[PDB]
Amino acid sequence: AKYVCKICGYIYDEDAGDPDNGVSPGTKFEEIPDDWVCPICGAPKSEFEK
């Protein structure tokens, strides 16, 4: 459900999303596009686990 970024740590809240890099609310992590990124640290999506 929540993936934490193992590099800069950011919490990939996919329900809150990350609009700053086009990652929306309601969007799931296994649904967050490959070039979406954290509004805070923007750490690489693949740094996501759940």
* 9 Rama sector, left if φ>0, alpha if ψ -120 to 50, beta otherwise: left
Binding-site annotation, residues:
5, 8, 38, 41
Method: NMR
Q: Count other C-beta atoms under 10 Å from residue 2's C-beta.
A: 13
What's the CATH code of the domain at 13? 2.20.28.10
- Spatial distance between the Cα atoms of 29 and 15, rounded to a whole number of angstroms: 9
Q: Give the CA angle between residues 38, 35, 12 to the nearest 5°.
A: 25
Cα distances (Å, whole numbers) of residue 6 to 26, 31? 23, 19
Per-residue burial over 7-38, b if 16 or more Cβ lie within 10 Å, else e, is eeebebbbeebbeeeebeeebebeebeeebbb
Cα first-last separation, the chain: 6
Residues contributing to the annotated binding site for Fe cation: 5, 8, 38, 41
Q: Structurally, how many domains does the chain consist of?
A: 1
For residue 46, what are the domain limits?
Answer: 1-50
Q: Under 8 Å CB-to-CB from 19, ≥6 apart: which residues?
A: 25, 39
At 28, list the tokens: 């799931």
The token pair at 27 is 């969007």
